């Protein structure tokens, strides 16, 4: 499969300034569920602002960058490059890589965060015409998920 896995606000925001604009440990243990013993492809600004690979799954990063070289990781130059990684692959971000990769995928697992951030980077339009709606699970509400945020699996009719 060919998968997105993307966390985004009720306008779409996914980042600002390199970070995510949420705090929800809710969907960083759904991000590590999902992808654990998997593979994650990400763009070069992605992954740099995190700065080092997810543990326990492949960590894959689209760069023009020829020097680019970090341990843990590996490298490609192309989008043609991610459809010949085996396995259940998934686009981790940013928005240049949803941009290329929205047309191109099996489906997607959303995190709506029900609430409006200021943000610099945003995940492409998409209606749900084009996409059924396999699952949506509400996140719980708590002390350190305070934000409401809800789970959708979409997948392209
Ligand atoms: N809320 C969420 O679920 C997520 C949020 N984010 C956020 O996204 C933001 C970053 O997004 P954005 O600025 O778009 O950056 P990206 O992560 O998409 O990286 C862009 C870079 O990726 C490389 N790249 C993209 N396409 C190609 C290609 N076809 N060939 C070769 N290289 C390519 C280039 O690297 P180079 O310049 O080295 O050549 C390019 O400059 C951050 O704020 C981060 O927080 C990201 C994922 C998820
Ligand atoms: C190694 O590169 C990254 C690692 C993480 C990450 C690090 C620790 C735990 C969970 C995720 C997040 C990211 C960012 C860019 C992302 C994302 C993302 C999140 C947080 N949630 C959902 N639902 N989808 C995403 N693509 C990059």
Known sequence: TLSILV????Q?????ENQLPWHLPNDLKHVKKLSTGHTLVMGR???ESIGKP????RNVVLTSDTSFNVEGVDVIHSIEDIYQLPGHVFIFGGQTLFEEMIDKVDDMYITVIEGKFRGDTFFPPYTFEDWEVASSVEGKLDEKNTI???????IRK
Not at 12 to 16: L, M, N
Not at 54 to 57: G, H, I, S, T
């Open 7 to 10: 966390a985004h606000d009720l």
């Open 12 to 16: 779409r925001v996914i980042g600002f």
């Open 45 to 47: 600004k992605t992954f």
């Open 54 to 57: 997810l543990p326990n799954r």
């Open 148 to 154: 409401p945020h809800t789970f959708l699996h979409l």
